């Protein structure tokens, strides 16, 4: 009955994210992808769009499910009877801030955070940089799942 | 006649800040906490909370500041800054400012890491966690914590 | 059935190590602590294993074994393909990242990193030995049984 | 025929920037300084270009142009495929690395990094403006013509 | 008449090195790979072996040549009428030490150092880690040029 | 009665070290340079070179040390260390030692960055460059530089 939560805004999900989802699904009995929403700032994609893009690119992972949430991550985790977070690392990750949040999350709720580095091929993509590059016409098709790329181009046009 | 300035926004002051205040006060004759000024607490409130938390430090005082930090320091006859380091400190930016401050006014900056127990609190993260109901009472002075609860509720 | 290996020299095991062991044992069905030996330290391999077993008596899904050679072979030979490594102040994280990417490339093994608790974040096996050698008190940073043994090796 | 682009907002150009411009112009047959504009600063694009040209008068193989949109398009449209970026204290190097790897992936453009001289390592456009705003003397960190103009904008 | 020196011990050359050689050869009129030797510590490969492995994997680069040296890098550079170094970055590079050496080299000889990050695929290989992995039987064949791999296995057996 | 210890191997002392010595001496009543002990110069030689370079600092003295640094500090009635930062400093290890030293003996560590001009010299790199004929005369006290040339030639 092991389990972990993979949190993020996923606006949109990238292949860097999916790599980490796959590793978590391979190493824990259940994985919940937590799409965390700030109710005070809209992203590019609505919550239902974000979830649909993740579901479409994780259909081969039977022990992974996707849910949205807001507020404290550790409450989302604990209310599902879990106490582990799995977070990806990429080039440009603010690791010091991730460490700060991990120590805080352990302090307030006893939840552990496990970090895993994404594959080198996917290590320089981020949701924000992919959106920025695509906005100005750059080809990011190789860094995003098919469930995302043309939806992204659609939002931009 | 030694002295140092401990600058920050302190909105609110944390035990991380207080730990560094205490070390500065133990190692310099005179310490001034500089409250540099759209946050949660007003300047006077921040000052009050720091004074309340530092009552046991006879050689420490608290003042608000505006403009160049080095001017704040120099206009009080000093030329040392003591700055704390915590998890999530942008140290590269701190170093840039330290070299700039030395260049323009001959003021030295001394960095000291806060205690491990208080190394992951920041004013911003404490407010965020408290806003969503998390317990940060172990990370703030007793007075501050009650005051924070007040601003929220 | 999930599982991970926690590798190190553990010469001696510290409370920083133990914290990570505990978190691994809480999150994986099986944990193996791999005591890695090189061609050299203060404690023998058997002594190190003994100290880890004493400190992890409450962890029934964790076991301790010695290992030699390629870490990913150690992992895969036991039917696992995850490594859990702790992070502390002074960890060469860039080198850990290099090794993690290498280990994934050559054997498909994943590496999960977890930061030890702030209280145990500045202890290391090497620094504890150095401080103890010159009479510093590191008893709050080591398991009780380890601290006793350490004094013995030094006196 | 070799060449590189040196991109930035240069609002205003600093001696840190100039040092890197000089090194680029010494090592490549052609250098283009790309003054990048966003939807916002102290100096207009034309003012920035003017200040860079004043400061680089002795560099005949360097020219200054404004740019918008995708940096790698700016580079490739001028028949080049190298970027030269400076490093200073406070540079977000991890983000620079991310962008370099992205820029290589999407367009085949290489990025070369060079550290500015220690004397100019703590100036940035933003910090110079901030210090000057409150009356600090940054004249040793900026070209003479830039310092004069800066005082003007503030007074 | 532009030019740069690409320095290292190259014991052995890796695909991370070759990527940087290729980028330097594409951006400078001439590139000299400097095989720097400590006369007080032998590596795994002799200087002639190192040079031969580099030459064999750079035959498609007409403006690159390979030479060995010792002592101060900036003397090697300046005695060839050049004043640029091109150095690669990978995962595990001690960048702070590289920066220190770059500032020192500029101070004492006026030589500039340009850093370039190796491709993600080659970002976790190093000569030392490749030797270590191969020593204990791990497969590093995809991280080294053909001119190296079996020579490496030969040294190890 | 303020004071700090500046520890290192100083083999030899550089202008980077001296810059930090000067700042420590300007901000603390009493400074002790601790020469901690197979290098190029003997302990006495290192001490001599530092004394010669710090003659203008009346409140600074130089002593050799062995064993725990915190014992050196505490046995002199102090509990502050001042440590310089340069390009290539292993800051993560410095932080580990600082937290350890606070834990075992209540000694604080204050870090200060050396001036940009002296930020890329280290004892080791200065010796290496000088060994192969490079000019490091701008990076070392005049006395030290001549002494170094002597050891080489
Ligand atoms: C690579 C990576 C980034 N993040 C942050 C996610 C975000 O903020 O959108 C992750 C979260 C979970 C798993 C992997 C990752
Ligand atoms: C722990 C800590 C952080 N900071 C900066 C906080 C800020 O810049 O607002 C400090 C400033 C003075 C003393 C201690 C600290
Ligand atoms: C905190 C920590 C350090 N290391 C490596 C230390 C060593 O090599 O002995 C670990 C290995 C496994 C779990 C936790 C840790
Ligand atoms: C020192 C330095 C900073 N940057 C970016 C600064 C900016 O974005 O304005 C550079 C760009 C080109 C060459 C040198 C530099
Ligand atoms: C990736 C990389 C590492 N290094 C150090 C070389 C070494 O020390 O063997 C390089 C040197 C030149 C070009 C690229 C590289
Ligand atoms: C610049 C600098 C480096 N270090 C450490 C050198 C060492 O640890 O040997 C210092 C120690 C005291 C004062 C200044 C410095």
Check chain A for breaks (C–N over 2.5 Å) and list the residue before each, or none.
Answer: none
Q: Do D100 and E117 touch (CB under 8 A)?
A: yes
Ligand 5 touching residue E6 (CB < 6 A): yes
State the greatest distance between any 2 C-alpha atoms of chain D, in Å, as a whole number: 46
Which among C86, C87, C90, C115 is the top mutation candidate for probing chain F, defined by the most F β-carbons within 10 Å of its own β-carbon? C90
CA distance F105 to C138: 11
Beta bridge partners of D110: D82
Using a CB-CB distance cutoff of 8 angstroms, which residues of chain D are in contact with residue A122?
none
Instruction: Please state the φ and ψ torsions of residue E104, each to the nearest 5 degrees.
Output: -65, -45
Q: Which residues contact B133 (CB under 8 A, 6 or more apart)?
A: A71, A72, A75
Give the pairing of strands F30-36 and B30-36.
Answer: unpaired
Domains of chain F: 1-153 (3.40.50.620)
Which among D80, D99, D115, D116 is the top mutation candidate for probing chain E, defined by the most E β-carbons within 10 Å of its own β-carbon? D115
CA distances from C151 to B39, C53, C129, D56, E89 (A): 53, 19, 10, 67, 44
Ligand nearest to the CA of F10: 6
Q: Please give the method by which this entry was determined.
A: X-ray
Instruction: Please state the φ and ψ torsions of residue D36, each to the nearest 5 degrees.
Output: -95, 135
Q: Which member of A93, A123, A140 has the closest CB to residue D106?
A: A140
CA distance A157 to B4: 56
- Does E128 appear as a known binding residue? yes
D85 CA from centroid of ligand 4 (Å): 6
Contact E1, D61 (CB under 8 A): no
Resolution in A: 1.6
Q: Do B117 and C122 touch (CB under 8 A)?
A: no
Using a CB-CB distance cutoff of 8 angstroms, which residues of chain E are in contact with residue A124?
120
CA distance E46 to C76: 35
| CA-based nearest distance F98→chain C, Å | 9
Q: D17-31 burial, b for 16+ CB within 10 Å, e for fewer?
A: bbbbbbbbbebbebb
Which residues does E contribute to its contact with C (CB < 8 Å)? Answer: 90-93, 123-126, 129, 133, 136-140, 142-143
Beta bridge partners of B5: B32, B81
Count of other CB atoms within 10 angstroms of residue D101: 22
Q: Could you tell me the two tokens for C33? A: 């602590």
| CA-based nearest distance A15→chain D, Å | 14
Contact A86, A20 (CB under 8 A): yes
Query: Based on the number of CB atoms within 10 Å of its own CB, is F30 exposed (0-12), middle (13-18) or buried (19 or more)?
Result: middle
Give the residue whose CA is nearest to atom 4 of ligand 2.
Answer: B84
Show the beta-strand stretches assigned E in chain C. Answer: 3-8, 30-36, 62-67, 82-87, 110-115
- Does D121 appear as a known binding residue? yes
- Does F64 appear as a known binding residue? no
Contact B33, B59 (CB under 8 A): no
| CA-based nearest distance A40→chain D, Å | 23
Give the residue whose CA is nearest to atom 5 of ligand 1.
Answer: A8
Q: Which residues contact A157 (CB under 8 A, 6 or more apart)?
A: none
Using a CB-CB distance cutoff of 8 angstroms, which residues of chain D are in contact with residue E113?
114-115
CA dihedral in degrees (F39, F42, F45, F49; nearest 10)? 20
Ligand nearest to the CA of A43: 1
Contact C16, C121 (CB under 8 A): yes
Give the residue whose CA is nearest to atom 5 of ligand 6.
Answer: F8
CA distances from C93 to A88, A123, F93 (A): 15, 16, 12
Beta bridge partners of E69: E36
Contact F114, F85 (CB under 8 A): yes
Q: Could you tell me the two tokens for C111? A: 């590496």
Q: Based on the residue annotation, tell me whether E90 is a catalytic residue of this protein.
A: yes
In the DSSP assignment, the letter for residue D118 is G
Q: Based on the residue annotation, tell me whether A41 is a catalytic residue of this protein.
A: yes
Using a CB-CB distance cutoff of 8 angstroms, which residues of chain B are in contact with residue A72?
129, 132-134
Q: Could you tell me the two tokens for B77? A: 């006859």
| Ligand 3 surroundings by CB, under 6 angstroms | C 6, 8-10, 16-17, 20, 85-86, 88, 116, 125
Contact C96, C85 (CB under 8 A): yes
């Amino acid at each position: 009955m092991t389990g972990a939560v993979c949190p993020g805004s996923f606006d949109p999900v990238t292949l860097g994210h999916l790599d980490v989802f796959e590793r978590a699904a391979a190493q824990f009995d259940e994985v919940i992808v937590a799409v965390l929403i700030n109710p005070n700032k809209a992203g590019m994609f609505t919550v239902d769009e974000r979830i649909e893009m993740i579901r479409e690119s994780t259909a081969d992972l039977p022990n992974l499910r996707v849910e949205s949430g807001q507020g404290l991550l550790v409450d989302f985790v604990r209310e599902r009877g879990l106490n582990a977070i799995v977070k990806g690392l990429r080039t440009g990750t603010d690791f010091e801030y991730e460490l700060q949040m991990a120590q805080m999350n352990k302090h307030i709720a006893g939840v552990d955070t496990f970090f895993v580095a994404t594959a080198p091929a996917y290590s320089f993509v981020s949701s924000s940089l992919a959106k920025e590059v695509a906005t100005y016409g750059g080809d990011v098709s190789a860094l995003l799942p098919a469930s995302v790329h043309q939806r992204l181009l659609g939002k931009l046009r």
